[PDB]
């Protein structure tokens, strides 16, 4: 008599190199405006859910591993093409039982070595590399590495206006709905054409079937290493460009120059490599990785309680005996008073309570909101998140994304946990990195 029924239970694994942030509430903004600067005051309270987070910024080793994976995929693609000789062994469409299905690429055949292969294989391998007649060095062609990833948009497919059948659009009985309803929707797709150029277009078409919510992008992934020279004029920064990404002794130093797009591409790539390995059969819908929102970042830094205006225990920049906590410039042209001039090695400075490391300074961090000087008032209190995907035809003003936390270029005013900075979505620089977060599944009673 209505005892009730249940469903099979499945667990929530703990991803590697991750820590846990508990629930709570924090006060956003500072109440006393600085007398010198002209910025007026602002304040608003919020609350946020639970979520895991990366201890350290994304190092160089991981980005290099992602680059190698993309290169291997393109190489194996090139191997089986009519121009270079198609090998039927590297691409399989026949099932082991014997049936025909959709093709893919096989990952269980070792790549031939540089000289131990056949001649045509060598000419195929050499297709992606680059050669420079003046200096005689080989490097990964920047423009020939591309990556297409398909993501859905759930939140835009559940609005009351977005439903298909015309009966459910409006619930009032005084306002009827005519059968001929027209709702305009827009998607993104990227088309590779005959000659080998990537063209991206936005199409707007009437809402008929559900394919319209699908999105697909194409973005080059090689880091923008030419940033060092361009950002600083009349300075000898050429020493770092060539070395920063290649030399093996900087593997565990911070990354630099990643634009917003490439950041989303890495965040989306992590999901496939994670899932292809584990199995979660029954009732464990897994949530993909993503860039943190603004509120989650603030809550992570401010240590939870509203008294702390800096991400450490006290309110003084210096420590007990003559040392600096963060890698930031404390004196005019005295970049070297903090110990390090360039971005430094992670895990050098002491951690905060939770367990996060190098929270302020070193490199800044990307964020997934949009920029508007009235940003604080426009979002609801629970899980604030303002999201806007820009279209190509819009002016250049409306595609700025907030960056928060400061870096080694910033003065002691900017390292305050609550201070806003904006940088365009298409250009990277020499003092911005990123880090990844993940929504969790836990039980309230525990």
């Amino acid at each position: 008599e209505l005892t009730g029924a249940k469903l099979s239970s499945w667990n929530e694994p703990s991803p590697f190199g991750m820590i846990q942030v508990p629930r709570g509430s924090i006060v956003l903004g500072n109440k006393e405006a600085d007398s010198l600067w002209g910025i007026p005051a602002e304040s608003r309270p919020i609350s946020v859910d639970a979520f895991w987070m990366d201890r350290t910024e994304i190092t160089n080793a991981q980005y290099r591993q992602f680059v190698y994976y993309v290169r291997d995929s393109i190489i194996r693609e090139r191997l089986a093409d009519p121009a270079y000789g198609g090998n039927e062994e590297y691409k399989i469409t026949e099932n082991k039982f014997g049936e025909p299905v959709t093709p893919h690429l096989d990952w269980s055949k070792p790549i031939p070595s540089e000289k131990r292969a056949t001649e045509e294989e060598i000419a195929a391998i050499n297709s992606v590399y680059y050669t420079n007649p003046v200096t005689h060095d080989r490097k990964l062609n920047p423009d020939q590495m591309v990556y297409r990833y398909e993501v859905y948009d759930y939140r835009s497919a559940a609005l009351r206006e977005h439903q298909l059948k015309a009966a459910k659009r409006n619930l009032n009985t005084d306002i009827k709905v005519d059968p001929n309803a027209v709702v305009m929707i827009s998607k993104d797709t990227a088309f590779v054409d005959e000659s080998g150029n990537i063209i991206s277009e936005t199409i707007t078409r009437p809402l008929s079937s559900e394919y319209d919510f699908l999105n697909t992008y194409i973005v080059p992934i090689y880091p923008d290493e030419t940033c060092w020279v361009n950002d600083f004029p009349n300075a000898r920064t050429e020493i770092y460009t060539r070395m920063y990404f290649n030399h093996p002794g900087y593997d565990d130093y911070p990354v630099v120059g990643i634009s917003w797009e490439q950041a989303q591409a890495f965040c989306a790539w992590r999901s496939e490599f994670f899932r292809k390995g584990i199995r979660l059969p029954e009732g464990q819908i897994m949530d993909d990785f993503r860039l943190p929102t603004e509120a989650e970042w603030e809550y992570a830094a401010r240590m939870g309680d509203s008294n702390n205006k800096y991400p450490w225990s006290t309110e003084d920049l210096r420590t007990g005996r003559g040392c600096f906590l963060g890698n930031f410039k404390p004196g005019e042209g005295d970049y070297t008073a903090d110990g390090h001039l360039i971005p430094s090695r992670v895990s050098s400075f002491s951690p905060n309570d939770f367990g996060l490391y190098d929270m302020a300074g070193n490199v800044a961090e990307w964020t997934s909101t949009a920029f508007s000087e009235s940003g604080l008032k426009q979002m609801s209190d629970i899980n604030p998140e303002l999201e806007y995907k820009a279209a190509l035809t819009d002016p250049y003003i409306l595609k700025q994304k907030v960056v928060r936390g400061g870096s080694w270029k910033d003065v002691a005013r900017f390292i305050r946990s609550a201070t806003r900075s904006h940088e365009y979505q298409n250009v990277g620089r020499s003092y911005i990195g990123f880090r990844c977060v993940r929504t969790s599944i836990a039980f309230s009673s525990g």
Partner: protein
């Protein structure tokens, strides 16, 4: 020109809707432009280059017949077809020279460079409401209308204050959302836009009227400018006393027991 498809999606999401609310009050305020705080609207006393103050932009739109305003009858205010204001009656009453123009549709009436009073407008009426969000249970403010008043010389030296016309907020929302002005006297970067300066509630003023069932203005029950200012402080205690009393965060009673 026309906005993009995803641009029009952003606008409808941000608009504030007050369809249902279990507490809503209407207050009228008088914003003074000679105090530093409200100086933001009176930065160019005259038209220089592209910099334009608020009143300069308002007169600009109406010359192109792309905007609508209504006359101000004492006491009641309602925006219908009948009360729309014809340009000729408006121009003649306040005393500005005008001449027929050279393009039929580009400009309605030629106006001089300095005949338009841009330095004489000194005080603004702002009509606002405080409402209680049902789905989120937090207080918020919305702006409905804006009316500019000016000052003129008179034989007895009577400093006269006369209103000009009302304005609906929606009609103006798009014209002002892209022009940039500074935000302080000690920092001069054009970071913010006038649209954001109303939204964040950064103006100051004296409460002039409130919706009372007897429909009376404050002055009528106030004898002197001295006694009038005293009434405003207590009213601001009622609105602020509400926001404290609604939430119970911490009392000294529970700790001791």
């Amino acid at each position: 020109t026309t906005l993009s498809n995803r641009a029009q999606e952003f606008n409808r999401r941000l608009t504030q809707k007050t369809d249902n609310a279990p507490w809503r009050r209407v207050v009228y305020r008088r914003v003074d432009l000679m105090e530093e705080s409200n100086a933001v609207l009176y930065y160019p006393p005259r038209p220089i280059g592209d910099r334009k103050n608020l009143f300069s932009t308002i007169f600009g739109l109406i010359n192109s017949n792309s905007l609508d305003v209504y006359e101000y009858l004492d006491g009641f205010e309602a925006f219908t077809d009948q009360y729309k204001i014809k340009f000729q009656e408006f121009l003649d009453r306040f005393g500005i020279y005008y001449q027929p123009s050279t393009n039929k549709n580009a400009e309605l009436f030629k106006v001089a460079d300095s005949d338009i009073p841009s330095a004489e407008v000194k005080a603004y009426y702002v009509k606002e409401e405080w409402y209680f969000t049902p789905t989120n249970s937090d207080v918020d403010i919305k702006i409905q209308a804006i009316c500019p008043i000016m000052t003129g010389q008179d034989e007895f030296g009577e400093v006269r204050n006369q209103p000009l016309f009302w304005i609906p907020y929606e009609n103006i929302r798009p014209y002002i959302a892209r022009e940039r002005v500074m935000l302080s006297s000690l920092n001069n970067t054009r970071n913010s836009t006038i649209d954001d300066f109303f939204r964040l509630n950064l103006y100051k003023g004296d409460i002039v009227k409130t919706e009372n069932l007897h429909n009376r203005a404050l002055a009528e029950y106030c004898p002197t400018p001295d006694s009038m200012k005293m009434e405003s402080k207590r009213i601001d205690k009622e609105l602020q006393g509400f926001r404290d009393g609604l939430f119970v965060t911490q009392d000294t009673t529970w700790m001791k027991q």
